[PDB]
Amino acid sequence: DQQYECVAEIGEGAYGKVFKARDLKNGGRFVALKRVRPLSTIREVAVLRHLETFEHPNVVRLFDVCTKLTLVFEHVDQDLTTYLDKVPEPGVPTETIKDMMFQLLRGLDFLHSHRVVHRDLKPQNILVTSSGQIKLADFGLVTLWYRAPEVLLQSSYATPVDLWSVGCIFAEMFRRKPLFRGSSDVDQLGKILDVIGLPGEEDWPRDVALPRQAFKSAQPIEKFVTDIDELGKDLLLKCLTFNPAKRISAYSALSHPYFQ
Ligand SMILES: CC(=O)c1c(C)c2cnc(Nc3ccc(N4CCNCC4)cn3)nc2n(C2CCCC2)c1=O
């Protein structure tokens, strides 16, 4: 659009490239824009232009949709990735991990309550403002490291998909490196079960291509996620529960003694 001007390139990918641009009309503020190169997809934008009306403090603001499209949003300074890349030793402060995780679950509880699933939650799209405020981005239409077991298996794809990704990002917050760094669904699933263990046959998805009988003893987490309290250990384990039905929800997670 002519109401905006491209200065730099934020990110590239299959979904299309997003750019940092100057919103000349609105006091030359920095805005993030992404193009698109038509009936059941009308909903996607109707849910976002609606989600917008609640202006949740932990989700990127949308500014406009122009025409073949141009999507303008709020520009955030950096992501969680480059945030972790610059934090001095011995990593992120206990309280900084606990705070940023709250803002993450709030934005997740907001999206879930409004029947929205992120589906691709990674540090690359968990943005962080100058003030240090978490903003969820890259939703309302690679790296399997954050993919949930059931997505990998191709069974369910419901809201517990993001609670796995959050336990993966919660670990990476301490560790400062991906917990499960697989290279294929089968490799990912593997590396996952090498840590959490083989779940009971009762929790394995009934009727899927990959059987339980194709993989492991449960390993303690304090080994892989170094200096984490028994409370954070309790929360992250509930986040990383094989059975999506047993996996904690952002709403019960927002309650947990870890934030008390
Ligand atoms: C489509 C989006 O929701 C969206 C928005 C609105 C956005 C806003 N500010 C960003 N701000 C950032 C975040 C990081 C950078 N750097 C990119 C170059 N390397 C250093 C970090 C620059 N700007 N980045 C944004 N993204 C990126 C997240 C991952 C994919 C693109 C987005 O998807």
From Swiss-Prot:
Record's keyword annotation contains Transport: no
UniProt entry tagged with the keyword Transferase: yes
InterPro entries per UniProt: CDK, CDK6, Kinase-like_dom_sf, Prot_kinase_dom, Protein_kinase_ATP_BS, Ser/Thr_kinase_AS
Activity regulation remarks: Inhibited by INK4 proteins (CDKN2C/p18-INK4c), aminopurvalanol, PD0332991, 4-(Pyrazol-4-yl)-pyrimidines and fisetin, a flavonol inhibitor. Stimulated by cyclin from herpesvirus saimiri (V-cyclin/ECLF2). Rapidly down-regulated prior to cell differentiation (e.g. erythroid and osteoblast).
Molecular functions per Gene Ontology: ATP binding; cyclin binding; cyclin-dependent protein serine/threonine kinase activity; FBXO family protein binding; protein serine kinase activity
Annotated effect of mutating residue 160 to L: In a metastatic melanoma sample; somatic mutation
Chain positions found as N6-acetyllysine: 223
Gene3D superfamilies recorded: Phosphorylase Kinase, domain 1, Transferase(Phosphotransferase) domain 1
PANTHER family xrefs: CELL DIVISION PROTEIN KINASE (PTHR24056), CYCLIN-DEPENDENT KINASE 6 (PTHR24056:SF130)
Name under which the protein is recorded: Cyclin-dependent kinase 6
Organism classification: Eukaryota, Metazoa, Chordata, Craniata, Vertebrata
Gene designation per UniProt: CDK6
